Protein backbone atom coordinates (compact mmCIF):
# COMPACT_ATOMS: atom_id res chain seq x y z
CA UNK A 1 0.00 0.00 0.00
CA UNK A 2 0.93 3.99 -0.23
CA UNK A 3 2.15 5.74 2.54
CA UNK A 4 -0.03 8.59 1.58
CA UNK A 5 -3.19 8.52 -1.12
CA UNK A 6 -3.86 11.91 -2.76
CA UNK A 7 -7.49 12.37 -3.50
CA UNK A 8 -6.59 12.75 -7.31
CA UNK A 9 -5.49 9.88 -7.02
CA UNK A 10 -9.02 8.01 -5.92
CA UNK A 11 -12.16 7.82 -8.20
CA UNK A 12 -15.26 9.91 -6.25
CA UNK A 13 -18.43 8.66 -5.54
CA UNK A 14 -20.36 12.07 -7.20
CA UNK A 15 -18.75 15.20 -7.91
CA UNK A 16 -20.60 18.49 -8.92
CA UNK A 17 -19.23 21.74 -9.67
CA UNK A 18 -20.13 25.55 -10.36
CA UNK A 19 -17.92 25.90 -13.66
CA UNK A 20 -16.09 23.28 -15.78
CA UNK A 21 -14.26 20.23 -14.37
CA UNK A 22 -13.67 18.72 -11.26
CA UNK A 23 -9.15 19.34 -11.76
CA UNK A 24 -6.73 17.07 -10.55
CA UNK A 25 -3.99 18.35 -9.49
CA UNK A 26 -5.03 21.61 -10.54
CA UNK A 27 -6.67 24.72 -9.91
CA UNK A 28 -10.68 24.30 -11.50
CA UNK A 29 -9.00 26.77 -14.59
CA UNK A 30 -6.42 24.07 -14.95
CA UNK A 31 -2.49 26.04 -13.41
CA UNK A 32 -1.05 24.98 -10.83
CA UNK A 33 -2.90 24.94 -7.40
CA UNK A 34 -2.02 28.16 -5.55
CA UNK A 35 -3.60 29.31 -2.21
CA UNK A 36 -2.85 32.71 -0.32
CA UNK A 37 0.49 31.87 2.30
CA UNK A 38 1.26 33.58 5.68
CA UNK A 39 3.79 35.72 4.03
CA UNK A 40 0.79 37.28 2.05
CA UNK A 41 2.72 35.15 -0.70
CA UNK A 42 1.81 32.53 -3.40
CA UNK A 43 1.94 28.47 -2.14
CA UNK A 44 1.81 26.25 -4.77
CA UNK A 45 1.00 22.65 -4.59
CA UNK A 46 2.07 19.99 -7.29
CA UNK A 47 -1.24 17.74 -5.61
CA UNK A 48 -4.76 18.73 -5.04
CA UNK A 49 -7.96 19.13 -6.23
CA UNK A 50 -9.46 22.35 -8.11
CA UNK A 51 -12.87 23.22 -8.06
CA UNK A 52 -15.33 25.80 -8.12
CA UNK A 53 -18.51 26.85 -5.74
CA UNK A 54 -21.21 25.45 -4.83
CA UNK A 55 -18.62 22.16 -5.03
CA UNK A 56 -19.67 18.52 -3.03
CA UNK A 57 -17.23 15.88 -3.93
CA UNK A 58 -17.90 12.12 -1.98
CA UNK A 59 -15.34 9.53 -1.52
CA UNK A 60 -15.67 6.34 -0.28
CA UNK A 61 -13.28 5.12 1.92
CA UNK A 62 -13.56 1.60 1.68
CA UNK A 63 -11.16 -0.27 1.13
CA UNK A 64 -8.65 2.78 2.62
CA UNK A 65 -9.16 2.00 6.38
CA UNK A 66 -5.31 2.00 6.48
CA UNK A 67 -5.15 5.98 7.17
CA UNK A 68 -5.32 7.85 9.91
CA UNK A 69 -6.17 11.45 8.95
CA UNK A 70 -7.36 13.38 6.08
CA UNK A 71 -5.43 16.40 5.44
CA UNK A 72 -5.24 18.73 3.01
CA UNK A 73 -4.80 22.81 2.69
CA UNK A 74 -7.71 24.95 1.61
CA UNK A 75 -8.46 28.70 0.30
CA UNK A 76 -9.40 30.67 -2.38
CA UNK A 77 -7.33 29.63 -5.62
CA UNK A 78 -5.09 32.67 -6.35
CA UNK A 79 -5.42 32.57 -9.88
CA UNK A 80 -8.52 34.66 -9.17
CA UNK A 81 -6.43 36.67 -5.76
CA UNK A 82 -7.98 40.69 -6.77
CA UNK A 83 -10.94 39.23 -7.46
CA UNK A 84 -14.97 39.01 -5.41
CA UNK A 85 -14.19 35.37 -4.93
CA UNK A 86 -15.56 34.61 -1.60
CA UNK A 87 -16.25 30.99 -0.07
CA UNK A 88 -16.03 28.61 2.80
CA UNK A 89 -15.22 24.86 3.23
CA UNK A 90 -16.53 22.11 4.69
CA UNK A 91 -15.52 18.54 5.23
CA UNK A 92 -17.93 15.63 6.54
CA UNK A 93 -16.85 12.31 7.74
CA UNK A 94 -19.98 10.27 7.10
CA UNK A 95 -22.96 12.36 8.23
CA UNK A 96 -21.35 15.13 10.22
CA UNK A 97 -19.21 18.12 9.69
CA UNK A 98 -15.49 17.76 10.73
CA UNK A 99 -13.91 21.01 9.88
CA UNK A 100 -15.49 24.48 8.34
CA UNK A 101 -12.83 27.26 7.34
CA UNK A 102 -16.23 29.91 7.39
CA UNK A 103 -15.56 32.91 5.05
CA UNK A 104 -12.58 33.21 2.89
CA UNK A 105 -11.76 35.53 0.50
CA UNK A 106 -9.01 36.09 -1.88
CA UNK A 107 -6.68 37.65 0.61
CA UNK A 108 -7.51 34.95 3.30
CA UNK A 109 -4.59 32.49 4.36
CA UNK A 110 -4.87 29.49 3.49
CA UNK A 111 -6.02 26.78 6.13
CA UNK A 112 -5.09 24.01 7.36
CA UNK A 113 -7.10 20.78 7.75
CA UNK A 114 -6.23 17.19 9.47
CA UNK A 115 -8.98 15.22 10.65
CA UNK A 116 -9.46 11.91 11.95
CA UNK A 117 -10.42 9.52 9.53
CA UNK A 118 -11.05 5.98 11.54
CA UNK A 119 -13.81 3.92 11.38
CA UNK A 120 -15.36 6.08 8.89
CA UNK A 121 -17.03 5.12 5.54
CA UNK A 122 -17.02 8.25 3.58
CA UNK A 123 -15.49 11.60 3.14
CA UNK A 124 -17.45 14.64 1.71
CA UNK A 125 -15.54 18.03 0.41
CA UNK A 126 -18.27 21.11 -0.45
CA UNK A 127 -17.05 24.43 -1.25
CA UNK A 128 -19.77 27.23 -0.78
CA UNK A 129 -19.93 30.27 -2.62
CA UNK A 130 -19.68 32.81 0.55
CA UNK A 131 -23.34 34.14 1.06
CA UNK A 132 -23.03 35.94 -2.56
CA UNK A 133 -22.80 34.58 -5.55
CA UNK A 134 -20.39 31.67 -6.98
CA UNK A 135 -18.55 34.45 -8.74
CA UNK A 136 -14.88 34.05 -8.66
CA UNK A 137 -15.46 31.01 -6.22
CA UNK A 138 -12.33 28.89 -7.25
CA UNK A 139 -11.47 26.70 -4.42
CA UNK A 140 -8.94 24.43 -4.29
CA UNK A 141 -7.62 21.87 -1.67
CA UNK A 142 -3.76 21.95 -2.02
CA UNK A 143 -1.95 18.37 -0.98
CA UNK A 144 -5.69 16.82 -0.14
CA UNK A 145 -4.70 13.11 0.99
CA UNK A 146 -5.09 9.98 3.05
CA UNK A 147 -1.91 10.17 5.72
CA1 LIG B 1 -18.90 33.89 -3.51
Same mark, same amino acid.
Given at each position: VETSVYLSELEWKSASTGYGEIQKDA?? +????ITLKGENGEKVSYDKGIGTHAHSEIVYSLEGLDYYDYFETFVGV +????????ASISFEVYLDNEKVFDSGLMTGDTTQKHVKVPIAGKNTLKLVVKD?? +????? +??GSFGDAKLT
Open positions: SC +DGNT +DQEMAGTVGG +DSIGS +DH
